[PDB]
C-alpha cells in the first residue's frame, strides 16, 4: 500500500509506534488505541508526501492541506508529528529546494570533524535547523571513504561502490535528489581456477551449496550447542568453520570404517562357513569310501551287511543335503560381499580443488566483512541481517563521489585541516587543528558542541592521532578497543578496450592456497569505459599494502591473461591501488563485529560524552561531544546508508540539546 510503503521505506513499522516515537509522544502511546492509529496514519502519510517528492521541502502547512478529515482536525497533533519527522531527519533530509529561505539568526555553534557522508549529512541537517556549522576535513576533498578515481573518461570507485537494495534504503531518496546513474549488479559470477580454466557448473554449485551449509552449521554450533567460548576466549566464525569442517572429515572416516567393518563381519561369517564346508566335504569323502566298500560286499549278504550299505547310503545323502544348504548360504554371502564391495561411501569430504573453490567463497565473505573470518564474532557477526533492504544491489556508474560532493554544496568546509586535539568542558569546546600542508599553521575552533565522525580506525590509533582533553572515559575507549575495524582494497585497471564478458559484472579468481584466497579473488565490470576493479580481501588486504603497484598490477594481468588469453589483455592505460589500512585518515575500510564485541558496542560508540562541572557543586552539564559514522549505527554498520543515518541521528540529537525539542 501507499502510507504503508512510506513506513516501510522509512524503516518503520506501519502499525506500531517505535521506541523513539514513544519518547516524543508518551501521551499517545500510553493512551487509547484509536489515537495511536490516528498518529500512525499522520506519520505514515507525512512520510509518503515527502517520499513522493523529496526534491522540495515538505512544510507543516503543506502537510496539513494534504491531510483529510478526520486526521487534519488536531492540528497540534499534526504539527507535533511533522516537527518530529523533520528533527529526526525522516523528512526534509539530503538535498531539497527550500521553500522558506534559511533564517539569518543562527543559533549555536557546532564543529564537525570529518566530511565523509556521516559528517556531511549531520551538517546539512544542523544548518537546516538554524545552527552555525563548520566541518574540519583532513583530506583535500569531501566524501571520506566515498572516494572516486577520475582521469579522463575513466571513473572508478576506490571505496564504497554498491548501493544495497533500494527498499527501505535512504540512498533511494538521495538518488532522486542527486543524478546517480544507478545500474543493477547481475549477481552471476563465473569462477576460474588458478589455471584460468572455468569451474564446471556441477562443481560451482556443489561447493556453493556446501559453503552455505557450512555457514548454517556454524550457526547451529552457536545457538544449539552454545559453542561460543573456547579456552576462555570468544569463538570466531573462522574457528567454528574449522571445527565444522573437521567434523565432516571425521564423519567421512567414521562412515568408511563402518563400511569396511560390515565387510569384515561378512568375510568372517564366510570364513566360518567355508571351514564348515571343507570339514563336511572331507567327512562326505570318507563316508562315500565306506559306502563304496560296504556295497562292494557282493550279495547275497546277511541283514547286517545290508543294513551297512543302506545306512551308509542314508548317512551320505543327509551330509550331501547338509552340504547343499551350506553352499546355498555361501552364494548368499558372496552376494552381500560383492554388493558391499561396490557401495563404498565417499572417499573424501572435499578434494583439493573443492577446498580451493570453497576458499573462494570464504574469501567472498572476508570481502563482505572486510576482515579475516578468524576475527568475526561467531555469535554476532550477522546481527544486522534482519535489517537488509529489499531489491537488487546497484552500482554508481558516474562514481559514488557525486553524493558527498552534492551534500557539501552550501556548507562551510575547511579542507586540509587535520584535527589534533578535542577539548570539551562544561562551558564549551575547543578543537585544535593544523594545516596538513604545513603542520605548523595551528587553528583553534571554539564551539558549543563537537560532532566527532572520525573513523573507528583513527580512534583506535596508538599512539593517538587525535587527543581528547579530558580523555574519553573507559566505557567508550573499551568499546573502541573491542570493535573490529577491517580492511579491503581495490585495484583499478583502465584499458583501451573490453576483452572480458560485457554482460558479466563479476568474475572470480580461485587462489591456490587458503592463505592467498583473498588476493585478487574477484573482478568487477561496472562502468561505461573499459575498467575492471579487482578486490583484495581477508588476510591478503593488509599484506598486499606492502607490495608495489607495479607488482600488484602484474599479478592482475597474469590472472586475467590466464582466463582470457595472453594476446587479449593489453597493458592498462591507468592503474590505481588503494591502501586503506595505511590511509591515516581511515586506518582501515569499515567496521566488523569482532569476536569479543557485539551490537551493544555500536550503541556505546553513539553515546555522547558529557563533561564534568567546571565549578564543583554546579548543575549537571549538557553533553558536549557527539559521535557519528558507520561504526556508530548498530543496525546498519559499515555502509554509506548507515553513515548517512548516523549523521541524521546526531543532528537531531544535537538540535534537541541546543535548540530544544
Amino acid at each position: 500500500s501507499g502510507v504503508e510503503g512510506a513506513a516501510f521505506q522509512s524503516r518503520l513499522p506501519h502499525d506500531r509506534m517505535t521506541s523513539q516515537e514513544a519518547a516524543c509522544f508518551p501521551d499517545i502511546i500510553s493512551g487509547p488505541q484509536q489515537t495511536q492509529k490516528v498518529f500512525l496514519f499522520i506519520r505514515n502519510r507525512t512520510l509518503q508526501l515527502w517520499l513522493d517528492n523529496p526534491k522540495i521541502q515538505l512544510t507543516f502547512e503543506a502537510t496539513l492541506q494534504q491531510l483529510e478529515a478526520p486526521y487534519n482536525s488536531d492540528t497540534v497533533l499534526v504539527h507535533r508529528v511533522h516537527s518530529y519527522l523533520e528533527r529526526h531527519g525522516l523528512i526534509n533530509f539530503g538535498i531539497y529546494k527550500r521553500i522558506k529561505p534559511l533564517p539569518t539568526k543562527k543559533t549555536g555553534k557546532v564543529i564537525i570533524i570529518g566530511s565523509g557522508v556521516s559528517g556531511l549529512a549531520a551538517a546539512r541537517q544542523l544548518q537546516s535547523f538554524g545552527m552555525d556549522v563548520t566541518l574540519l576535513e583532513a583530506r583535500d576533498r569531501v566524501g571520506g571513504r566515498v572516494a572516486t578515481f577520475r582521469k579522463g573518461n575513466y571513473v572508478a570507485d576506490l571505496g564504497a561502490m554498491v548501493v544495497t537494495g533500494l527498499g527501505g534504503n535512504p540512498m533511494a531518496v538521495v538518488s532522486k535528489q542527486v543524478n546517480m546513474e544507478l545500474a543493477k549488479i547481475k549477481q552471476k559470477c563465473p569462477l576460474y581456477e588458478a589455471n584460468g580454466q572455468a569451474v564446471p557448473k556441477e562443481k560451482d554449485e556443489m561447493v556453493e551449496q556446501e559453503f552455505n551449509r557450512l555457514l548454517e552449521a556454524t550457526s547451529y554450533l552457536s545457538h544449539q550447542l552454545d559453542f561460543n567460548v573456547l579456552n576462555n576466549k570468544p569463538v570466531s566464525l573462522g574457528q567454528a568453520l574449522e571445527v565444522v569442517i573437521q567434523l565432516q572429515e571425521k564423519h567421512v572416516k567414521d562412515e568408511q570404517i563402518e563400511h569396511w567393518k560390515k565387510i569384515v563381519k561378512t568375510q568372517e561369517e564366510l570364513k566360518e562357513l567355508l571351514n564348515k564346508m571343507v570339514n563336511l566335504k572331507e567327512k562326505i569323502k570318507e563316508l562315500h569310501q565306506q559306502y563304496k566298500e560296504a556295497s562292494e560286499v557282493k550279495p547275497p549278504r546277511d541283514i547286517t551287511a545290508e543294513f551297512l550299505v543302506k545306512s551308509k547310503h542314508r548317512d551320505l545323502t543327509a551330509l550331501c543335503k547338509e552340504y547343499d544348504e551350506l553352499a546355498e548360504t555361501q552364494g548368499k554371502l558372496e552376494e552381500k560381499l560383492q554388493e558391499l564391495e561396490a557401495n563404498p561411501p565417499s572417499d573424501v569430504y572435499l578434494s583439493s580443488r573443492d577446498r580451493q573453490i570453497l576458499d573462494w567463497h570464504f574469501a567472498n565473505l572476508e570481502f563482505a566483512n572486510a576482515t579475516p573470518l578468524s576475527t568475526l564474532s561467531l555469535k554476532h557477526w550477522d546481527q544486522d541481517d534482519d535489517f537488509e533492504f529489499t531489491g537488487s544491489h546497484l552500482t554508481v556508474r558516474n562514481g559514488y563521489s557525486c553524493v558527498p560532493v552534492a551534500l557539501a554544496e552550501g556548507l562551510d568546509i575547511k579542507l586540509n585541516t587535520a584535527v589534533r586535539q578535542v577539548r570539551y568542558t562544561a562551558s564549551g569546546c575547543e578543537v585544535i587543528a593544523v594545516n596538513t600542508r604545513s603542520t605548523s599553521q595551528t587553528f583553534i575552533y571554539k564551539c558549543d558542541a563537537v560532532l566527532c565522525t572520525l573513523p573507528l580506525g583513527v580512534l583506535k590509533q596508538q599512539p593517538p592521532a587525535v587527543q581528547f582533553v579530558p580523555p574519553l572515559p573507559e566505557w567508550k575507549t573499551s568499546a573502541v578497543q573491542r570493535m573490529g575495524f577491517g580492511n579491503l582494497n581495490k585495484v583499478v585497471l583502465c584499458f583501451d578496450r573490453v576483452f572480458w564478458d560485457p554482460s558479466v559484472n563479476l568474475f572470480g579468481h580461485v587462489g591456490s592456497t587458503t592463505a592467498s584466497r583473498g588476493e585478487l579473488f574477484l573482478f568487477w565490470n561496472l562502468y561505461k569505459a573499459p575498467i575492471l576493479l579487482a578486490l583484495v580481501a581477508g588476510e591478503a588486504a593488509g599484506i598486499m599494502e606492502n607490495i608495489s603497484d607495479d607488482v600488484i598490477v602484474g599479478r592482475c594481468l597474469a590472472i586475467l591473461k590466464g582466463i582470457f588469453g595472453s594476446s587479449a589483455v593489453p597493458q592498462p592505460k591507468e592503474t590505481v591501488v588503494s591502501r586503506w589500512r595505511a590511509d591515516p585518515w581511515a586506518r582501515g575500510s569499515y567496521s566488523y563485529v569482532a569476536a569479543g564485541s557485539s551490537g551493544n558496542d555500536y550503541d556505546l560508540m553513539a553515546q555522547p560524552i558529557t563533561p564534568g562541572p567546571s565549578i564543583p557543586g554546579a548543575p549537571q552539564p549538557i553533553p558536549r561531544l557527539f559521535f557519528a559514522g558507520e561504526h556508530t549505527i548498530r543496525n546498519y554498520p559499515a555502509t554509506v546508508h548507515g553513515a548517512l543515518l548516523s549523521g541524521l541521528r546526531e543532528a537531531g540529537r544535537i538540535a534537541d540539546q541546543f535548540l530544544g525539542a
Partner: protein
C-alpha cells in the same frame, strides 16, 4: 536441528576442541583404524580364497543317485530286520529309519514301533541306543 548431511554432536565437538591438536589426532587415529581394518580384510580374503580352492570339485564325485521306491505296506522279514537295526542306530528318528528301509512311510515306521514293541524288545533297543 543441524543441516542435512552435516554431523555435529556435542560429543564430537568437545573431542575436536578440547586440545590444541585434538582434531588431527582424532582424524589420525581414524586413519590408522581404517588402515588396520583394510589390512584385516586382506588376510580374510586370502584365507577364504585358500578355502574355496579346497572345495574345488564340489561334492559331485560323492553324490549317490536318488532312487525312488514305491512305498509298500507289507513288512518283509528283511525289512523288519532293517528297522530293528535302524532303531538301534537312529533311535526315534523316524525319518532316517524310513530312508534306510526305502519303502516305508514315516507313519508306517511309527506304527511298526508299537505293533512290534513287545516282540522286538524295542524298549530294550532304544535303551541300548542311549548308552553311546
Amino acid at each position: 536441528k543441524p543441516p542435512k548431511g552435516m554431523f555435529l554432536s556435542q560429543e564430537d565437538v568437545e573431542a575436536v576442541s578440547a586440545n590444541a591438536t585434538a582434531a588431527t589426532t582424532v582424524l589420525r587415529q581414524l586413519d590408522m583404524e581404517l588402515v588396520s581394518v583394510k589390512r584385516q580384510i586382506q588376510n580374510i580374503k586370502q584365507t577364504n580364497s585358500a578355502l574355496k580352492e579346497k572345495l574345488d570339485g564340489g561334492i559331485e564325485p560323492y553324490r549317490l543317485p536318488e532312487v525312488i521306491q514305491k512305498c509298500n505296506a507289507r513288512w518283509t522279514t528283511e525289512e523288519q530286520l532293517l528297522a530293528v537295526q535302524a532303531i538301534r542306530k537312529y533311535g526315534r528318528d523316524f525319518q532316517a529309519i524310513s530312508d534306510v528301509i526305502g519303502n516305508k512311510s514315516v507313519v508306517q515306521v511309527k506304527n511298526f514301533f508299537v505293533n512290534y514293541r513287545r516282540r522286538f524288545n524295542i524298549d530294550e533297543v532304544l535303551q541300548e541306543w542311549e548308552a553311546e
